[PDB]
């Protein structure tokens, strides 16, 4: 059996982003020493990373000291080298080539991104140990103390370290709040206990904290404490079976299974919409809860019984008509057959889908007239099963079974050619025809058809009535869809059973409707018209037979009236299924059912109820053949037990049931179903325009216009994610797929009552801690993105033939670069030139039809330089190369790819943007080329320094830090740590939990980490066998 | 149970031509989201006071708090109106309020009802009462709003304790919760209480009572370590910068005087400063949950109440149960505290007085000068994503001693 | 709550039986009266509502009645709002009666069929009220007319008192009089078109008939 994985488990460190050394520098000059060379001088190991150029770079879960394995997570590599793969993933399908990738399916690969780093970060930060830090290093401080691996205290507590150097990471180190290293304070107050918690100041990634912080009240609010616990058994358990209720203190008890009906509701309907068309499906499930049921209950069907009690009357041999074998014979004998009838049973829980239905066997083979006491006996059979069935129908066609047989002796009142007097009964299974005179007995000609009027009366006022019995637990509710919370109604009427022993109780429903039909052939063998046919003899001996299968002691009655409402109850906490039940009726022909339905999609606004949907959507019906004469012979000779103690007999036999707590790992199941739905929803709205308020900040990131195709790919990829995240054989939302198009999850629970009655039923979702999440993860992202490697604004390729250190990175982009710019002119035509005429230059067509040189300011949408590429190439590249047309390159947001070099050396890049050009392809770009000289720190000469790429925004924030273990950086100056990043330590202003986002993600604040265990449901409490 | 006449009432504008939001701000509330119901509310709020309660559209939790209210407001008078109404934005996914959906397109006839400061009975409205069951979980949502809206001040939170008949199988279940702060709790509680439609069974019922008050206790000063409800008081974690967290604390000291039968406050908050304390709006969570069970001595009396929520249904009046709300600025409320503490001779004030004293009204400052420039902003945009309120409001004053007093008083 | 259910709740408002009670008719379908297929629901409603209307018309000041509010009130089943259905035609009469109205015909002792069917017959026509009410509560007649004690449940009269007239005064018992009637047509000031007149002449008139000459 497939559980969730809800429990995943983290130590070490929350840290989802990596501290980056990119360049140390070996021996660094000659006549000095290389600053940096220090560490390893003095033996120790720097906690932070100092050398010449270091970077931050996203990493998921890269400083994480568990046993535990999620195994989906986001690796990036440093933006010096190329890290395209990551953002092709999705959908580059069509565009094999490893260098490219598509721009405009970049808010999508994005999005999957985002959506697999939350998900391989839902994680129980717990407490490992900790140590009273009386030290010189530490002020009397208390660290983790991981258990392995000294290397990683050192990273988690910068603090730590001693200073040798008066060097500028030293400075920033020795201007910052020191006391906050490690652990603050503890939380147990339970003498003789260990703690529930730490508070610990920790190197603690705020935006992966937020993640987990989130899924631990997510968890949270699920979990259950024992008292609460107890009542949800004690009522499953109605009171016959018995749980020791412990006076303790509650020990932290980690036990999220509740779930809300909610979800267990749309768990449900995705069950039932994967069950693809075919009848049969439901058989299989039907009746394993037939054989469940056949093996818990103290019933005793001994059909041998019945066949004594016949043998008692004494005839002349004379006469060939045998009742007595005739019946035998027809009755299958076997005592295997139950299947039948316990199906029966277990059907009127499931009638909103799941249907018996009195099938055209032990159907009057003959018709005929009143010739043959066989056909008499065969309606008997069927009026008998019929009350049993889950059919609405089954009155009509209990009268039609004879109104068949009474074909000749006497005309009666039928309808059309199609509702002609020989048309079996069968048939008559829909609410449009319901016969006139079966609706109307009163009018049936009295003098006439005198019997058959009988019969009907008998019917309609001797038919059991429907009744209602209670089941599951008032804290929770139930899962319940058309049905009131804890309800189910039984078809027959419900009489409590007390805790009592045994009686053969024949003041039942069920009897008096044997008796009266028994009766009623009575009269019709006595019937003055058929008596003078008759050898009389004979005519007493049938109804000596009739009356002695009357006077059989039965128990079957008893049962069906007093115990089968509490076997359902019993059955139904426990079902593979939940009850699905939708109104049982009558005999009342203004409210029959003709269907339950299922909606998946909304064509924006149909609300054409029911008059599409019975044609354009999911009927909902199965229908399941069930056999006649196996019901009535388990009805007929029905025994319990001689020493039946009913109290006692239920105590033993329910026992073992309800030990298994599988049903609450079924709970778990659904919330994630629940989750994913949303889920799913609220990111393919950032693709695709929804019917449903989303946030949306990704608007900027080109993308292609999104099909239905498109959205159904990327659905099952978000989809396909979650099953493997929470290791998930079973099938999540797929069904939904199959339908051609999933991209509308607009759902409606759904029933037809003929007479135009729909219930069409929907379900809004609650909370969603992980849409939540990811979201803030998108608002962050639309600052941080250069923590991706993703780079913001557009290029403009220019030639710069300088002396000193213009970052590439950081462009203070006054350049006109804008519409509004001198000389700076659009090109976004298609293909279109002119070559040389009149001793002219070849020129460009502009925006407004004016030829211009290639000499110049061009605006290029990066799609107009796709499709016509090695133009570009040709023409204008020249002109880059050695001259100057200042191209503009519209580019939206865009990846890099970082070179460093030697800044006291003579470089162009044209060699490498060169390649960068021809590369082109109109359906892929190969990430961005900035190369830069190193910061240097010493006084040295000046080279020729050729740039190309410029860019109308800064990009710089991803630069951890310059030189660190250096005394002056000089020459390629830059700048050191950002201070922002760890407000509260540096700052002792700050106490370790402000409004940060989405502003600046902070690296270092107090981290809880907590003790919980997880106990089993069966565990918590202690057992009474004695039942 | 089901309180036929379950009145409430949404919000007043402040000296607004419309209710408060502007239409961007009512866009991201219903369209972000999806359901009516406090799931998504209540997971901003639960994160145990580390993220920062500031954002661009959401200021604070209690900002949050009153767009929530007005949202309720606004949208509400749609389909609770007459012959029901619903366009502009919202037009109700289903008549039974199933979700917050942007106008279905061949639906115009039902206006967008421009309604001012009214009070609405749900019960008179039939497509509300046929669905009494569903209406259930929002009645309590409900609360929420009417109980800040009916002022203009920080929530107006019920007390209640019942003493003497006190169940053993409470104390019991009680202290298996012991290490959570209070925040916690609310939230299982409120989810249990939505989730079953709600019962008569008294037992969740009198835990958050109870729960209400020992917190309310504690936070006086007539609880502590030493005086307890039998081992029970809440400890103020982190004696340094104004954080200090009240968890749940069973400890065995002394068992505090059984008052005199059934003792019952309502407190509120004069300050702004209420909406920076998870602690305060945490038990007035928790007294709305109460409501939803019990019919509450009709509604703290139109005496300190603005004109507009004055002469309302069946809940103001003037001779009845709680004429006078009682009322508290929270820095000097601390200082109360502090006091009893050392009255007692539970601690010298020499270090720990002083202390505390001084990081609180740090915090008091650091607040009110970001509520006050944040404010700035609605007081001069269309725009109110936050509560309504002048300098002077901040003074303290508000009868915060007074309530102290009472409160102690209380629990003889 | 307890009873998922709705068939009809039919809570007394007046004096409870034994105690403060309902009853609940079971699900059955009662074809005594052509073409009426009816829950007993129905049939309690209109009886108890005839006896009314006929205690109404007997009302005495000063005489000791044994209920005043001779009528039940319905709960479940409420599902519909608008006046499709018997059930809900029952409710406004209820209303009505109990409000202190009088029928002209009044019905006999134990009724007839025959008047019952008659009645029935009358009452699923056209036509509709001022007064509607709440299904939360029983308004009765903010002209205190009306002999409202405090009940239980109802709170008085309709919430909203609108502009309609009323008055009081007792039914002149006369017998069905075996005999044709003659009618002086006094006449009132709003003066029909002469084709209207005609029109609805021929739209009302049981004529032709076979006329008895009789003697010249």
């Known amino acids: ?1027 | 149970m089901a309180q036929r006449q379950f009145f409430g009432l949404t919000y007043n504008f402040y000296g607004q031509p419309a209710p408060l939001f502007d239409l961007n701000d009512l866009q991201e509330l219903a369209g972000c989201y999806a359901r009516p119901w406090t799931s998504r509310f209540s997971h901003l709020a639960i994160s145990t006071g580390s993220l920062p309660v500031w954002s661009a559209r959401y200021p604070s939790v209690a900002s949050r708090n009153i767009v929530v209210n007005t949202l309720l407001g606004a949208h509400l008078n749609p389909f609770a109106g007459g012959q029901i109404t619903s366009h502009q934005g919202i037009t109700w996914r289903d008549p039974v309020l199933s979700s917050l959906a942007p106008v279905p397109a061949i639906q115009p006839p039902p206006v967008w009802a421009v309604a001012e400061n009214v009070l609405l009975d749900s019960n008179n409205y039939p497509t509300y009462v046929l669905n009494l069951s569903s209406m259930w979980p929002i009645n309590q949502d409900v609360h929420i709003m009417t109980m800040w809206a009916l002022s203009d001040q920080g929530p107006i939170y019920h007390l209640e304790v019942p003493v003497d008949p006190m169940p053993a199988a409470t104390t019991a279940a009680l202290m298996a919760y012991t290490g959570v702060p209070i925040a916690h709790l609310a939230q299982t509680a409120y989810r249990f209480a939505g989730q079953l439609p709600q019962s008569p069974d008294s037992t969740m019922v009198s835990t958050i009572r109870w729960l209400s008050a020992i917190w309310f206790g504690s936070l006086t000063g007539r609880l502590n370590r030493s005086r307890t409800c039998n081992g029970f008081y809440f400890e103020f974690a982190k004696p340094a910068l104004n954080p200090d967290q009240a968890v749940l604390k069973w400890n065995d000291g002394a068992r505090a005087a059984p008052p005199a039968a059934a003792q019952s406050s309502y407190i509120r908050c004069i300050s702004p400063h209420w909406q920076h304390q998870i602690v305060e709006v945490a038990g007035a969570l928790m007294s709305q949950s109460v409501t939803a069970v019990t019919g509450l001595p009709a509604l703290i009396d139109e005496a300190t109440l603005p004109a507009w929520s004055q002469g309302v249904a069946n809940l103001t009046g003037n001779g009845q149960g709680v004429v006078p709300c009682l009322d508290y600025n929270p820095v000097p409320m601390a200082a109360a505290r502090h006091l009893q503490w050392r009255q007692d001779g539970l601690i010298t004030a020499a270090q720990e007085a002083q202390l505390n004293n001084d990081y609180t009204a740090y915090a008091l400052t650091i607040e009110r000068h970001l509520t006050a420039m944040l404010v700035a902003n609605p007081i001069a945009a269309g725009r109110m994503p936050i509560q309504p309120f002048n300098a002077a409001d901040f003074g303290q004053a508000g009868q915060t001693a007074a309530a102290v007093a009472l409160a102690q008083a209380m629990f003889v | ?216």
């Open chain 1, 1 to 1027: 059996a497939n559980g969730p994985e809800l429990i995943i488990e983290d130590t070490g460190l929350c840290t989802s982003f990596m501290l980056l050394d990119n360049i140390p520098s070996a021996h660094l000059t000659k006549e000095l020493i290389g600053f940096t060379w220090f560490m390893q001088m003095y033996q120790m190991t720097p906690p932070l990373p100092e050398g010449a150029v270091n970077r931050i770079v996203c990493m998921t879960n890269w400083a994480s000291l568990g046993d535990e394995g999620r195994g989906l997570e986001v690796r990036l590599p440093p933006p010096t080298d190329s890290s395209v793969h990551a953002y092709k993933t999705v959908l580059s399908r069509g565009y094999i080539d490893n260098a490219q990738f598509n721009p405009l399916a970049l808010r999508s690969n994005v999005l999957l991104m985002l959506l697999q780093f939350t998900l391989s970060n839902l994680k129980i930060n717990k407490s490992s140990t900790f140590t009273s830090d009386v030290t010189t290093i530490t002020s009397g401080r208390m660290i983790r103390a991981f258990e392995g691996r000294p290397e990683l205290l050192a990273l988690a507590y910068p603090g730590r370290a001693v200073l040798p150097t008066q060097t500028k990471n030293a400075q920033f180190l020795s201007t910052a709040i020191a006391d906050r290293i490690g652990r603050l304070d503890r939380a147990n107050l339970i003498g003789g206990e260990v703690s529930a918690m730490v508070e610990c100041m920790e190197l603690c990634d705020a935006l992966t904290l937020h993640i987990r912080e989130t899924y631990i009240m997510l968890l949270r609010s699920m979990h259950q404490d024992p008292t609460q616990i107890v009542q949800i058994v004690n009522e499953c358990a109605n009171n016959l079976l018995n749980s020791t209720i412990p006076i303790s203190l509650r020990p932290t008890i980690l036990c999220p299974w509740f779930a809300s009906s909610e979800d267990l509701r749309l768990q449900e309907v995705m069950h039932l919409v994967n069950i693809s068309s075919n009848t049969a499906a439901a058989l299989p499930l039907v009746e394993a809860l037939s054989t469940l049921l056949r093996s818990v209950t103290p019933l005793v069907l001994d059909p041998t019984v019945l066949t004594n009690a016949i043998t008692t009357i004494s005839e002349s041999t004379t006469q060939t008509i045998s009742p007595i074998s005739e019946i035998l014979r027809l009755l299958q004998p076997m005592g295997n057959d139950y299947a039948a009838f316990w199906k029966c049973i277990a059907s009127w829980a499931y009638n909103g889908l799941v249907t018996t239905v009195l099938s055209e066997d032990a159907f009057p083979d003959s018709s005929q007239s009143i010739t043959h006491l066989p056909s008499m006996w065969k309606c008997l059979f069927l009026t008998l099963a019929g009350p049993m069935t889950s059919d609405p129908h089954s009155p009509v066609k209990v009268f039609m079974a004879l109104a068949n047989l009474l074909a000749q002796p006497e005309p009666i009142a039928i309808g059309v050619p199609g509702m002609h007097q020989t048309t079996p009964a069968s048939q008559f299974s829909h609410p449009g025809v319901w016969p006139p005179g079966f609706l109307n007995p009163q009018l049936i000609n009295p003098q006439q058809a005198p019997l058959l009027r009988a019969f009907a009366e008998h019917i309609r006022a001797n038919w059991p009535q429907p009744s209602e019995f209670g089941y599951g637990s008032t804290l929770q509710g139930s899962a319940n869809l058309f049905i009131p919370s804890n309800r189910m109604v039984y078809p027959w009427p419900n009489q409590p059973l007390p805790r009592l022993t045994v009686a053969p109780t024949y003041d039942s429903a069920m009897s008096n409707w044997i008796s009266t039909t028994i009766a009623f052939f009575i009269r019709v063998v006595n019937s003055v018209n058929m008596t003078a046919t008759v050898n009389d003899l004979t005519r007493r001996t049938m109804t000596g037979v009739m009356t002695a299968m009357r006077q059989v002691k039965t128990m079957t009655p008893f049962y069906i009236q007093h115990m089968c409402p509490t076997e359902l109850s019993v059955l139904a906490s426990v079902t593979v299924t939940p009850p699905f039940q939708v109104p049982f009726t009558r005999l009342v022909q203004n409210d029959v059912i003709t269907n339950v339905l299922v909606a998946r999609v909304d064509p924006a606004q149909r609300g054409d109820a029911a008059v599409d949907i019975r044609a354009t959507h999911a009927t909902f019906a199965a229908a399941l053949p069930v056999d006649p004469a196996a019901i009535v012979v388990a009805m007929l000779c029905g025994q319990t037990e001689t020493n039946l103690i009913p109290s006692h007999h239920y105590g033993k036999a329910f026992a073992p049931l309800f030990a298994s707590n599988a049903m609450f790992t079924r709970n778990q199941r659904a919330v994630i179903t629940r989750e994913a739905f949303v889920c799913a929803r609220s990111a393919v709205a950032q693709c695709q325009d929804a019917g449903f308020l989303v946030p949306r900040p990704l608007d900027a990131l080109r993308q292609f216009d999104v099909t239905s195709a498109a959205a159904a790919e990327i659905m099952h990829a978000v989809n396909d994610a979650f099953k493997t995240a929470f290791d998930l054989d079973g099938a999540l939302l797929d069904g939904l797929a199959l339908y051609g198009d999933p991209r509308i999850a607009d759902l409606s629970a759904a029933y037809l009552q003929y007479g135009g009655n729909v219930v069409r039923e929907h379900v809004p979702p609650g909370p969603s801690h992980i849409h939540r999440a990811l979201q803030q993860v998108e608002s962050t992202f639309m600052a941080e993105m250069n923590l991706f490697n993703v780079a913001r604004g557009n290029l403009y390729l220019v030639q710069t033939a300088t002396n000193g250190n213009w970052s590439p990175m950081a462009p203070v982009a006054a350049p006109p670069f804008v519409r509004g710019g001198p000389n700076v002119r659009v090109v976004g035509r298609f293909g279109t030139i002119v070559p040389r005429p009149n001793g002219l230059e070849p020129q460009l067509i502009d925006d407004g039809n004016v030829p211009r040189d290639i000499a110049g300011d061009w605006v290029y949408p990066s799609d107009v330089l796709q499709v016509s590429v090695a133009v570009f190439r040709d023409y204008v590249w020249p002109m880059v190369k050695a001259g100057r047309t200042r191209v503009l390159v519209e580019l939206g947001h865009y990846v890099y790819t970082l070179h460093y070099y030697d800044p006291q050396i003579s470089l162009d890049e044209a060699p490498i943007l060169e390649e960068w050009l021809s590369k082109i392809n109109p359906a892929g770009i190969p990430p961005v080329p900035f190369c830069i000289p190193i910061p240097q720190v010493y006084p040295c000469i000046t080279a020729r320094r050729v740039h190309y790429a410029f860019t109308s925004e800064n990009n710089n924030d991803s630069l951890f830090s310059t030189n660190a273990a250096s005394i002056d950086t000089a020459f390629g100056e830059n700048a050191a740590v950002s201070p922002l990043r760890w407000p509260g330590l540096v700052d002792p202003n700050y106490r370790v939990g402000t409004n940060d986002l989405p502003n600046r993600i902070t690296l270092y604040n107090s981290l809880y980490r907590y003790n919980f265990t997880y106990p089993t449901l069966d565990g918590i409490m202690y057992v009474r066998s004695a039942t």
């Open chain 3, 1 to 216: 709550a307890n009873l998922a259910a709705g068939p009809t709740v039919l809570e007394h408002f007046d004096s409870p039986t034994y105690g403060p009670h309902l009853l609940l008719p079971q699900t059955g379908d009662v074809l005594g009266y052509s073409s009426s297929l009816i829950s007993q629901a129905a049939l309690l409603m209109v009886e108890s509502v005839m006896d009314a209307l006929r205690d109404n018309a007997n009302a005495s000041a000063s005489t000791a009645v044994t209920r005043l509010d001779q009528s039940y009130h319905p709960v479940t089943s409420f599902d519909p709002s608008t006046f499709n259905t018997l059930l809900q035609r029952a409710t406004n009469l209820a209303l009505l009666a109990v409000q202190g109205v009088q029928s002209e015909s009044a019905i006999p002792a134990i009724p007839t069929m025959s008047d019952v069917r008659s009645f029935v017959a009358r009452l699923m026509a056209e036509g509709d009220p001022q007064q509607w009410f709440p299904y939360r509560v029983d308004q009765i007649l903010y002209w205190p007319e009306s002999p409202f004690v405090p009940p239980i449940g109802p709170f008085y009269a309709p919430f909203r008192p609108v502009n309609f007239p009323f008055t009081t005064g007792s039914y002149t018992v006369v017998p069905d009089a075996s005999r044709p009637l003659r009618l002086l047509p006094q006449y009132r000031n709003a003066t029909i078109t002469v084709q209207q007149a005609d029109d609805a002449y021929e739209d009302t008139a049981l004529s032709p008939l076979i006329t008895t000459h009789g003697f010249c």
